[PDB]
RNA sequence: GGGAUGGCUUGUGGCGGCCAAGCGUUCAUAGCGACGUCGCUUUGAUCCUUCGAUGUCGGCUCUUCCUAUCAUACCGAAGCAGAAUUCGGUAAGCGUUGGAUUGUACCCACUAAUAGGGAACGAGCUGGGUUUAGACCGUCGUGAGACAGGUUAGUUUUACCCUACUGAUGAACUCGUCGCAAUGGUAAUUCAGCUUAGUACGAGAGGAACCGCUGAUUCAGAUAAUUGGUUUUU
RNA sequence: UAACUGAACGUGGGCGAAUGUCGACACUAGUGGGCCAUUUUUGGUAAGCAGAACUGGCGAUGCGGGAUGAACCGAACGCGGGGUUAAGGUGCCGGAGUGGACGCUCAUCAGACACCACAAAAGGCGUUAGUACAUCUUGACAGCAGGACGGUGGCCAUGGAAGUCGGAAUCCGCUAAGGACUGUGUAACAACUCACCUGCCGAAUGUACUAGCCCUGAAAAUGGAUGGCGCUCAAGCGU
């Protein structure tokens, strides 16, 4: 859902006389910016603990960048989405180069295939498949095969949309 | 995947056996071993095998197993670290194709004599070579199709002629009688079911079974036997010739 | 509104009184020249299966059809002489009925 | 799901000569020559081994993968047709009126022509013209049998179906009136 | 039916004897064998209409026992 | 002086009780509920039980549309032997009549069949609803009069305007002759007889169909040799 | 008040949250039981609906967009110039993209303004993505070649009924496995077949649900309507 960045958001309850050192809660949140990241932090924290924004504070917001954005990786995402019936689990896999790109591909795929919006999807886990034996979806298993080489038949050539007329009928073989 | 074959659910009493039958076979074979001195392996290849019940009845003191080949091999023990008794992994190399186990207390010579002089004429199955030429004569079709003289044969049933037409015999109903061509027999030749020196297919063997024509034999071939006292496997004549695994 | 008198008997009458009333009333409609007084205030509401058993014993499915189990007909006769007499009487009655019907281009509307 | 690669194999006998150009299959055999236009299905042809034709689809869906089986069976039937041929034996049976069948070969059209007469005593004379390459004969070994032979399975089976459909009883009980021409045996010439 | 006891909408409707839903009627219960503690036959009992007769063509009632 | 419900509707009842896939529900184990089922609503009878116009519909001429198909065309199934059918499907191309009854909507006949609707019923003509003024009877009222009502006789009377339609001329391009065809309309319909054949089929009674031939019904377009009609041929 | 002990009112002295920034008369009016809508609430209906409270709009009002318009969205209005937007749009009509990324769908009048009704726990051998349970080299699903037996023609019944017109029971043995039988069939038998098992094969399948898009889920009557053309890796749908 947009150019997403992963943030660690650490927050806590406001210190009182009973608890001078309240517990810190850290979450990894995919959001377009820090305001949305803090909003999602307060939402997920209201879903789990007796802390809201008026009674708590944000200790830290940091950006978690990808360690190796130049390495092709397989990601398994376990998610829960809310439909007309209720909340359902989905396990999906994406062959991307970063967790953020995997999450954008996830959001586009769920919007395309199940009409699920950003407001109705909970990202529960995003993990890296260390071995290719952990890959379970056949559309990624056909990509992790040995000596994968394929042609590209029927490639429509890119002709400028401002050039209306051409004197040669284009070919679709390059 | 909306377009799928509709799986028919059978409204019958008998269900699938499953893993419990495999475990029962394992228990029965592993309990039969310490009771008999000799364990024979016999082969019945490309055969009807409905006289095996008569063989079981005649060998009252013996025990016959005719289950899955790999399950019997696993029951006996394929490796020397798995065998129930010594030399049984030597015997397991004989178990391939359609085979069976025979646990016995009797003499090996007696068992060989019985399974050598045992011989019953049986219906041929698909793949066997036809020993002769069978031709149903023209005219009215009888039950044997010319094996017995036609004056000693009942006419064939009227319910069989759609099956005969499906199996390729150009029969027709004339006044409640199944005939090739005309009732007296004309304008056609006899229907050749099979020719000598020809591999029989299932259509021809089904025709021969419907006309009660038997072109095969019931021969059980003993491959070898393991003895408990000596702890060794003695190989018989068919053991050299049969493929080994 | 809930009330206790909705669940009570509103009209009761004893056996002998009902029987005497019915007998006297029947004697009253015996005479056509006698008329009642205040009949609207009189309890006049008190004054005013072989096929099922046969079908219950023998269903239609058990009588005739693919599921039929009937094997014995229902006869009006027991002896050969009774059958001969039955046939003779039936033939005579049949002839009488056709004679009656005979005694009793399309026609105009 | 879009499958990256799917392939099928067709073995070719030594007598058979296959020429494929722009999805136009030409199969040559001892009995004759067949030609078919498979330009309506996106298939890439190749020679994966000496005497084996390779069918492939790249980036196709499940339907595009499944269509290769139809292509495989069509080319295999063309090979079987040019090698051994196809033969449909048909029987015509009658109850009271004998059915008269006359087979000719119209030379200007170069095709066989089957003429059916006296079906349920009808005075009409039915006529069926066969597809080119389909040879129709009256069997001398059996009684009231036609034999349709050819290299094209579709042509032979369609001609047999046309013969079977042209003699159809109308406005009568099919339980009682059993007459007609029926396809009895389907097989190969050789 | 013996009488119409109460039509809940209007006493004029009761006076006219209108059979509507929820109307209390008096019925002859001689066929049900209802008897008192000594043997007198109870032949009049209240029942309530549970259907809409103007829409259904029939009067359906439940005994008030 | 003021006025003149509508993406409704259609083929399968209500009330009351059981049963049950399921929905809910585990600190409460209730409550709804598809598919069903059960009770109330003459041995082919009876003909001696017709149960309230405040609300109005008919008819003539004529055109078109819908299908929710009566007939014709084709097809599937049924003890469908044949004949005659019955149920169902695609189909609106083509037809769907003549009469009796007003003490007040059903009968009869021909026919292949006598299918159902819309364009009104959310200023053409003509009979009832229906009702100005005359008159009579019945009910009511002291009465004038009114009506539960019944009966009789009784005034709206364009077109030459615009558009639409049906036909008929026409300027400009010299006049005229012979043509092409964009587009618009479009047409045929049903029955009978001969042969097949007293044949297939059938115990019998009965009894088809394809190819071929000849007429007739309804419709349409013409025509006047003949026959009727018409006569100011005065 | 036991009391200058208090109660008021004076004498004198000293010293306070944010944000934004009028009152009284005189005279004269029109309107004061209107319409629509959000939210809350009280009654109901077969479904409709009927009422109250606050707020906004209209009657009094133009403009941009909903193709069009009393109630929708944006926005309120002197005469002009330049710049930027809101709502809505960028295939043509039409000013602005046949823009970019990932997928889904082929509809015999799709869809592009839906929420209401038809209408249901509805029907789909259409197409994708998932969940749960189960089988599987000890050989899964499908097929092919075979077996599919004995007591026993189980009991009663029936002219006849042998697993297969009926009623009630439905057991044991040989088993690898086989029902006192799933259908075809006979007058009854016979015969075939199914459930089940074994041999060949070769690696992934089966069932039930969930969520998308698509078809059906009822239609009349002049010829017509996503506004029109037209659109199918869209000019449809989701982001």
Swiss-Prot record, chain B:
Residues 237-245 have a biased composition (Basic and acidic residues). It is found in: Nucleus, Nucleolus; Cytoplasm. One of its GO terms (molecular function) is RNA binding. InterPro entries: Mrt4, Ribosomal_uL10, Ribosomal_uL10-like_insert, Ribosomal_uL10-like_insert_sf, Ribosomal_uL10-like_sf, Ribosome_Assembly_uL10. Gene3D superfamilies: 3.30.70.1730, 3.90.105.20. It holds the Pfam family Ribosomal_L10. GO terms for cellular component: cytoplasm; nucleolus; preribosome, large subunit precursor; ribosome. One of its GO terms (biological process) is nuclear-transcribed mRNA catabolic process. It comes from the Eukaryota. Keywords: Cytoplasm, Nucleus, Ribonucleoprotein, Ribosomal protein. PANTHER family: MRNA TURNOVER PROTEIN 4 HOMOLOG (PTHR45841:SF1), MRNA TURNOVER PROTEIN 4 MRTO4 (PTHR45841). Component of the ribosome assembly machinery. Nuclear paralog of the ribosomal protein P0, it binds pre-60S subunits at an early stage of assembly in the nucleolus, and is replaced by P0 in cytoplasmic pre-60S subunits and mature 80S ribosomes. Belongs to the universal ribosomal protein uL10 family. Associates with the pre-60S ribosomal particle. This is Large ribosomal subunit protein uL10. It comes from Chaetomium thermophilum (strain DSM 1495 / CBS 144.50 / IMI 039719) (Thermochaetoides thermophila).
């Amino acid at each position: 859902m947009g150019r997403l960045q992963e943030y660690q958001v650490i927050g806590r309850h406001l210190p009182t006389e009973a608890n001078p050192n309240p517990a810190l809660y850290r979450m990894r949140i995919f959001a377009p910016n820090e305001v949305v990241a803090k909003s999602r932090f307060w939402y997920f924290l209201r879903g789990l603990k007796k802390v809201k924004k008026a009674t708590g504070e944000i200790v830290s917001v940091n950006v978690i960048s990808e360690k190796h954005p130049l390495k092709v990786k397989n990601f398994g995402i376990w998610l829960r989405y809310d439909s007309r019936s209720g909340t359902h689990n989905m396990y999906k896999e994406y062959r991307e180069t970063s967790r953020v790109a995997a999450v954008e591909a996830m959001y586009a795929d769920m919007a395309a295939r199940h009409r699920a919006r950003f407001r109705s999807i909970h990202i529960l886990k995003v993990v890296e498949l260390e071995k290719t034996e952990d890959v379970k979806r056949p559309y990624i298993k056909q990509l992790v095969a040995k000596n994968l080489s394929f042609p590209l038949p029927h490639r429509v050539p890119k002709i400028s949309t401002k050039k209306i007329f051409s004197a040669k009928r284009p070919s679709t073989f390059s | 995947p909306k377009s799928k074959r509709a799986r028919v659910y059978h409204l019958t009493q008998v269900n699938k056996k499953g893993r419990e039958a495999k475990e029962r076979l394992f228990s029965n074979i592993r309990e039969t071993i310490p009771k008999y001195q000799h364990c024979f392996v016999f082969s019945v290849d490309n055969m009807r095998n409905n006289y095996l019940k008569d063989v079981r009845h005649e060998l009252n003191d013996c025990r016959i197993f005719f289950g899955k080949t790999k399950l019997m091999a696993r029951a006996l023990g394929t490796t020397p670290e798995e065998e129930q008794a010594d030399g049984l992994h030597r015997l397991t190399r004989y178990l391939t194709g359609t085979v069976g186990l025979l646990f016995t207390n009797r003499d090996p010579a007696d068992i060989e004599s019985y399974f050598s002089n045992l011989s019953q004429v049986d219906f041929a199955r698909a793949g066997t070579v036809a020993p002769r030429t069978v031709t149903v004569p023209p005219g009215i079709v009888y039950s044997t199709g010319g094996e017995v003289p036609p004056e000693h044969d009942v006419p064939v049933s009227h319910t069989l002629e759609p099956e005969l037409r499906r199996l390729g015999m150009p029969v027709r109903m004339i006044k409640g009688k199944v005939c090739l061509g005309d009732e007296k027999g004309e304008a056609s030749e006899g229907y050749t079911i099979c020719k000598e020196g020809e591999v029989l297919d299932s259509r021809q063997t089904r025709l021969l079974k419907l006309f009660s024509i038997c072109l095969s034999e019931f021969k059980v071939s003993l491959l070898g036997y393991w003895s408990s006292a000596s702890g060794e496997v003695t190989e018989l004549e068919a053991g050299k010739t049969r493929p080994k695994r | 509104e809930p009330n206790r008198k909705w669940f009570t008997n509103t009209r009761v009458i004893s056996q002998d009184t009902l029987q005497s009333f019915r007998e006297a009333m029947a004697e009253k409609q015996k005479d056509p020249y006698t008329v009642l007084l205040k009949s609207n205030k009189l309890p006049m509401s008190l004054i005013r299966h072989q096929a099922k058993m046969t079908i219950e014993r023998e269903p239609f499915s058990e009588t005739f059809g693919p599921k039929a189990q009937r094997k014995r007909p229902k006869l009006s006769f027991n002896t050969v002489d009774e059958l001969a007499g039955y046939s003779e009487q039936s033939l005579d009655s049949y002839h009488a009925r056709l004679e009656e019907k005979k005694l009793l281009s399309v026609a105009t509307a | 799901m879009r499958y990256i690669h799917s392939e099928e194999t067709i073995p070719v006998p030594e007598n058979v000569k296959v020429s494929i150009k722009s999805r136009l299959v030409t199969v040559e055999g001892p009995r004759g020559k067949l030609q078919k236009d498979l330009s309506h299905i996106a298939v890439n042809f190749s020679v994966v081994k000496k005497g084996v034709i390779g069918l492939e689809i790249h980036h196709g869906s499940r339907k595009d993968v499944a269509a290769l089986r139809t292509v495989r069976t069509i080319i295999n039937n063309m090979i079987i047709g040019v090698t051994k041929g196809f033969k449909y034996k048909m029987r015509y049976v009658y109850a009271h009126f004998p059915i008269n069948v006359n087979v000719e070969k119209n030379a200007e059209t170069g095709c066989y022509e089957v003429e059916i007469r006296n079906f349920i005593g009808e005075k009409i004379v039915r006529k069926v013209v066969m597809a080119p390459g389909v040879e129709v004969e009256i069997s001398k070994a059996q009684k009231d049998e036609l034999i349709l032979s050819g290299n094209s399975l579709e042509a032979v089976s369609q001609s047999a179906a046309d013969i079977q459909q042209i003699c159809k009883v109308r406005n009568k009980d099919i339980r009682k009136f059993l007459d007609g021409i029926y396809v009895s045996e389907k097989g190969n010439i050789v | 039916i013996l009488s119409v006891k109460k039509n809940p909408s209007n006493p004029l409707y009761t006076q006219l004897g209108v059979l509507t839903k929820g109307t209390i009627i008096e019925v002859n219960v001689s066929d049900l064998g209802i008897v008192t503690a000594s043997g007198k036959i109870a032949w009049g009992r209240y029942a309530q209409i549970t259907n809409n007769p103007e829409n259904d063509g029939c009067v359906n009632a439940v005994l008030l026992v």
